[PDB]
Amino acid sequence: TMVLPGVSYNETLLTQASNDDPVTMPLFIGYTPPPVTVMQPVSVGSLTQANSLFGQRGTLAYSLRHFFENGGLQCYVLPLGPGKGEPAARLQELIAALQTPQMLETLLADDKTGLVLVPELSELNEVDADALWYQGWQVLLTLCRQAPQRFALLELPEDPASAVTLTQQSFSADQCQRGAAWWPRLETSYQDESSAPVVLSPLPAVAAAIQRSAHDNGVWKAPANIALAKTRRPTQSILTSQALLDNQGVSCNLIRSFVGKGVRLWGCRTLLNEENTAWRYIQIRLLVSSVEHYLSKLARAYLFEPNTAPTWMKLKGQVWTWLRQQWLAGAFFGTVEDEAFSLSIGLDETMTEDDIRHGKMILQVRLALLAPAEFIAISLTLDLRD
């Protein structure tokens, strides 16, 4: 009478809680779509939550739809405000907002994400464009250098000799180490409210391929050889623009399409164009920072302990156990343990008595990592035999 218990119908979202994986968590830093707080990062769960917060049409809204339809697990969005309009002015207030010291108080006091991404620098293609591109990268490459474990996801402009002049620009070695560019911008299958297709940056498709091939295969594998789901084609192929093959700038990653298989990510190699330093190869930078994230989790468990020799060996025994299990899981190179990793805490091994009295506890880890199979050098031998 008072109540009628029965079967209803509604489209509310139940949601899911905590996907962890802080190292491969993307962070989208576009402008708010036209009641989230103007600065705090917002946990976006499924694609239903991305529409219930941010609508369906925009620039950040299509990048979230292209994130979860490429196999993304969870994303965070850092809003910035209801931007102006006249998009040559939104896109120099975007860079000016990212240079504020209030960006550092939100990225350093975050500890939930690990892939910095601004997908709205793709709008610079419409639009000095070169000046805006270089202080678009270099602002992102310093927010990650400063932060303990963040990786930038960058992109090149479509026009060659504007993407050539960006790679032939000065970036310090410390900064290159942590950030990557994928060149060909993606033509999606989303309508633009008319017959014409929506062209998005490749980077929401990349950040979904990074954290699903780190969830499925492990973060040590590679982010490449991944079929991009809901893309028609990359807007430009490498057979029509032989620029960017000039070996005089930062390493770039190519997104291509094949015949028997679709649009593939076809590279994993950081902005370091150095042949011997193993801080190229994205999965090397993301594996060793996934070991930073856990070994510093059990290090600060033994933090406000005495500096006596028992607590040094309580810490080696826990780190040696964990590193041996990851070697037997396939994460490190080496057919014996002596060439896979090493630990060396001690009083006259790493520390000294002056280091102990200042309250330090210094532990050394050496690692041996795996190399990709980027080139297959087939040979044929006849072997006559009568």
Partner: protein
């Protein structure tokens, strides 16, 4: 009543071929013998195109 499902589309033989011979960019990277098969395929391409051209007239 008419329909007009007609065309002007033609696909040359050289891009039927797999990606170890050609489709390399024009007169920049090929080396005067990878252009020799371009000229080998030119009369065959236009003899295949004349059927399309006569068909559309």
């Amino acid at each position: 009543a008419g329909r007009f499902r007609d065309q002007t589309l033609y696909i040359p033989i050289g891009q039927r071929q797999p990606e170890c011979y050609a489709l390399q960019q024009p007169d920049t990277v090929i080396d005067d013998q990878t252009r020799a098969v371009h000229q080998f395929l030119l009369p065959v391409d236009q003899l295949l195109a004349d059927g399309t051209a006569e068909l559309a007239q």
